[PDB]
Amino acid sequence: GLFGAIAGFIEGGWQGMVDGWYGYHHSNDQGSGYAADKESTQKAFDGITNKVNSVIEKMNTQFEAVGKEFSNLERRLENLNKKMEDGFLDVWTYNAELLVLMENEHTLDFHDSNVKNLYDKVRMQLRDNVKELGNGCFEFYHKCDDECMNSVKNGTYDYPKYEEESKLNRNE
Amino acid sequence: GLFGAIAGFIEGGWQGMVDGWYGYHHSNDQGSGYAADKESTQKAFDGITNKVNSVIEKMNTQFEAVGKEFSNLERRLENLNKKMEDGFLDVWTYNAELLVLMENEHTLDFHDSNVKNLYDKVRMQLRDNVKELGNGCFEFYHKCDDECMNSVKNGTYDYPKYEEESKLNRNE
Amino acid sequence: GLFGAIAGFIEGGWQGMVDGWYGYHHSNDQGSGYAADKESTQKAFDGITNKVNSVIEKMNTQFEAVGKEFSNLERRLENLNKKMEDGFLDVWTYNAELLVLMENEHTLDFHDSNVKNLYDKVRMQLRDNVKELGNGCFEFYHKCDDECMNSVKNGTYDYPKYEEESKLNRNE
Amino acid sequence: PGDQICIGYHANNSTEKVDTILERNVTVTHAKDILEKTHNGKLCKLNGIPPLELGDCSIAGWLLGNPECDRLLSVPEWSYIMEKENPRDGLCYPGSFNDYEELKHLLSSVKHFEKVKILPKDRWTQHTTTGGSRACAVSGNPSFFRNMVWLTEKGSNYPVAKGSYNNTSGEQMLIIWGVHHPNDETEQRTLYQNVGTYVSVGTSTLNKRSTPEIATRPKVNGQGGRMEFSWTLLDMWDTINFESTGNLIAPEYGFKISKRGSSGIMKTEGTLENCETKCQTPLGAINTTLPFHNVHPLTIGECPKYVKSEKLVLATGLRNVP
Amino acid sequence: PGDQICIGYHANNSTEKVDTILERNVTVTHAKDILEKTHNGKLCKLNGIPPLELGDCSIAGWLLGNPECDRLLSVPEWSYIMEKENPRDGLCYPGSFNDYEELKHLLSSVKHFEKVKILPKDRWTQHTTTGGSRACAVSGNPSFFRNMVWLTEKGSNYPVAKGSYNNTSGEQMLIIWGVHHPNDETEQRTLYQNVGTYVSVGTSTLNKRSTPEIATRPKVNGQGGRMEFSWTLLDMWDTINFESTGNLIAPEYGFKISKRGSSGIMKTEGTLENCETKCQTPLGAINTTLPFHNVHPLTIGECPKYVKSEKLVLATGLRNVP
Amino acid sequence: PGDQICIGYHANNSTEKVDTILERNVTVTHAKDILEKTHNGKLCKLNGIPPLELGDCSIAGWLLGNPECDRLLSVPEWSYIMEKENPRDGLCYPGSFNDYEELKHLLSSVKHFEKVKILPKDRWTQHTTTGGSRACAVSGNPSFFRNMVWLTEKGSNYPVAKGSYNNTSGEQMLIIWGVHHPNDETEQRTLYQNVGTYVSVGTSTLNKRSTPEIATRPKVNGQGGRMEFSWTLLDMWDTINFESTGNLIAPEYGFKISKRGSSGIMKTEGTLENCETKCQTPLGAINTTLPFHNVHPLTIGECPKYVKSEKLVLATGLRNVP
């Protein structure tokens, strides 16, 4: 896309995941499964359900009667009215359409940045303790069980703890 | 620019490249030269093409006729019409101007993203097999003929293959 | 924000900084302190300043007078008028309401980019002579005194200068 | 070996296709539509207060009381006016109506509207008031607008006829009068006797003296004559003054009127059903928070902005990829 | 040694500049401009079907039939009207025209059109049919609007001018008449005999009456009198009855006429060339697709949104750096 | 130890908040508001040239010469007009004013302008030029519109009154007349002697003949009568010719006129002060550069865009964080 994450270095989506838009994927010695991220899948929905609640609520309604009200000797007037209505039609039509697009290119790229910003959240915590496969995954230079993963996730990974076990398998 | 690539960590642009918007320059034991990336340069041109169409096609024309038809005893109408035409010109004028300005800020950055994506798409495929010069180039920790260079441009680099030969040269 | 920096991996900002927007903070043997980046601060200033001048300058005002003008046997015109003055109010209101919401977003992100693009302009020069702390700081593998930092700020840092000296502190 | 941890995004079996500046037909996971394009097919009350319903009648034939209209509902308050494109029953006896559209604009919506006798048909002891016409026939026999009196000669004398009203009804009163333009001089004589006749009407604001215009015209409803109806708003406590020596189609009733602000007439061939709405269209009512719509241009009420657009689909989720 | 590969962008010898929210005078590799600003200095046919060119006459002068306008090109169909700012030849006999503007509008565009004879000049046996004036001079010899009949007295006697017409010409018909406003009491007497004359006109929907208002006036065109003109559209099958005791300026001709949708009048000095166009301006026709333009406000057809704007330049390429 | 180098962004004690498409209530460092919302309460001149304050008068009161308006400042050039909603000093003698609205408009903005007598009061030597009235009486004694000569009978004879003038004031002239509409016959006779009178006015573009209409009306300001005023604009080098056998309320003065363009009337009660502005409103002027405002809709001048908006805050700094 525009942040390269979605439909980019991460080739595709995970049907399996159902509890969110952004998530993780583990393949340690205790099988495999999916798990979305609360803190970032809620920041999303909030500012996206504050995007629709922005384009919708900022509109001014104002009570109006749109109708004829002109004789056959007031055809100049009718016409004037028509130029006006036509006028506001072309304006709102244009604006609305380009709003939809503009706000969609953004919405979509927003989702990208949201992901790419999470991948990095994790990458920048691990560093050399992992092989940056280059596809959204990280390979561990040490066995990482369930209690560990859930500390990479919740954002509390202990680097030093594994620093010395890992600089082993890395070199060789 | 906004993504750091264009006129950023890649100081300038190759007048040499003549076959696309964003491509590569290599230098191996076999020689040197340019060669743009078929995909990216096409994914972009499609976009931009689509962008100018959205801003043109989405406009409703209708069919009007502006003109007098206001006796010297209908000045107030003359005025309503003026206030009307003058109110719309303003709207359409300010809308065009700002459309451009916005659509322009975004186009240039699209090109930025596009470049940085290519850079990232290559980088992440090479890894510790190369020296990241930080000027928009990678220095190889192994020998890369042409059938090799291609593998990079084409997205099929075999890191595993040159993994061992490289970690060798890399250490010393 | 959208570029993961401001309010992202650089949790907070610096009260201690007072001479520009984004800047540094060196912490060696000879003291410690803040130094905002005059370069990337005077470019964004020019940015924003030139932004607010676009939304102000491009507003073509013209010249008009509003008012009654209509009798009691002209209720209709009086109304058309209203259907218009109102019609344009609804437009100008909506446009400006959003125009802000957008410009505000693109502006806060512009900042986030400007911080990110600086943090990378530095990282990519330093490479493995330093230790990416994933907090906004790097830890030098060597002694980096004052006059050193200065060759970094103007972006002429000599990577070869501290390569071995630090490639030693790295491999233990 | 070598354990792994991966980063990815949701996906599903969706087909919601949104558009963007750069790319069309993008499949995404979820999307909202902000283009209201669905109505309910029922013409409904507007803010609870219903439309005056005119059936096959026209405002004019209604106020004057064209017999075919006596079966209309007599609401004392409405919010807009329903009316067919080209009603059948208006000026049964042919003619015209001055500043007619303004009146229609005045009457488009009222807070209060009540018909009231002010110049009783039997007051004209000096004239014949039982005069009808075949163009205004009722069950075979000649008749006339149930709300006007058609003052004519009696005993071959049309004495100068006066009539007045001090507006003491608690609110402004719409009053209508008309003058008759006959086809020929022998018709003037037969109905009025005198000639060089005048119709004079007066208030503290209005002052007209109309002079009947006799002339030949194409029979319309078998009538060469024409009735030129005019109107006014007689303020409270203000008196109105009729005087004529011929050709005066005076009124019997006035209409007390109150306005909360005006609305508009909606052309349609349909009928009121028992439903509510903030926004009515010739095709149906609208109930929506959406900003835009394409239901129909001729709206009444508070309505979303009308556009010449087919679909407007915001994207809520992300890009759906296999 | 050390093999390298590098990633970078296009660049060229491009001066093209664009502005952005944040930056100005920015050079880019290439760009698209969406602001149309070039016409073609030619007044052209519209959507295929030509305009109408009164040249140096007005719609008044044209219709009435000012002698100076007999040489024009009869166009059964058109899509707009070309008329100088202040035509020289209009109402040769000085006066006014009622609902003139409203009329001009009606005519701006017509699916069909064709002058027809309705009330032959010599059918007026009761009165003369060859009166004229010096201000409609046809080479030293006095005359009149080629389509109008200045009915005058015959034998110190002005009968009752009765004239009708059934509109069977297969479609609506523009019809015109007027009333002479003489300079003094005596003149009225000279030309029409009877004083206190009137001019009545009637169709199924129209009833109008004019009455000469005698005032003293500057000799515009060496004439002190004035002729107030009035018009109507007589429906298919409806009839129009004239009836006057004096001052009635009759029609000899009507105009069959069909509409397909309004248009407009363009005040130009130039003439028509052999070309086509979807959108037209005083300066010349436009052939474009861009959203906007800035040639001339007064526009006619399918045109881009006029804007008070100098340049609209979209940056397609990328930032062009050495 | 290990020397470090951290990177970060500016922050401060700012509470200023801005809104984004995704996040509401967001503190920033520096913000520029663009919604002008403060006036000054002082109705200043405009572009350097003052208004035209009228006070408790109506524009009708002004032009004619209602003695209650003698005190007004006769500025020859002005940019707009101030005038209460419901003035008291308008028509002392009840009546009406034709094309009043269009008129009020003409005289909204004027380049040049000057009151210049054209038909002297003492030129009426055959008539009485002092028959004023009570409702328009100065300090008890009956009086009349200072520029409006009330022609009445003298010598129990009212001979045709004539009035002619050639426009040679370099520019156009706004001349104003009126006819009288008496309550009963015995009033007409008492004043004009003749009966079945008339009032004719004439130029190259004008031509009215008013026949005084009589009727019975509620006494307004102690008068059953009414004066119906018309007006015209005499083109350069033209001639306006009156002619009246009675009822005419002739004009004594005329108004040279030149327009650069048009403005409009302001419904204020306040009074002009020694200031300046390019944008005036009922509630005050505006010295702002911002592109919008929410002051008052009824603005005059070169102005921001009036929006139904409370706040329009642009973020210029960066998200401020602890």
Ligand SMILES: *[C@@H]1O[C@H](CO)[C@@H](O)[C@H](O)[C@H]1NC(C)=O
């Ligand atoms: C797609 O999946 C949803 C549940 O997530 C299900 O309700 C729907 O029927 C599916 N669509 C089809 C047509 O397979």
Ligand SMILES: *[C@@H]1O[C@H](CO)[C@@H](O)[C@H](O)[C@H]1NC(C)=O
């Ligand atoms: C009309 O009635 C009210 C109350 O009876 C009275 O004050 C007013 O003067 C009356 N008008 C006339 C014409 O008598």
Ligand SMILES: *[C@@H]1O[C@H](CO)[C@@H](O)[C@H](O)[C@H]1NC(C)=O
């Ligand atoms: C209009 O423009 C098109 C190309 O945009 C051109 O082919 C055509 O000739 C033009 N039409 C005319 C009649 O000049």
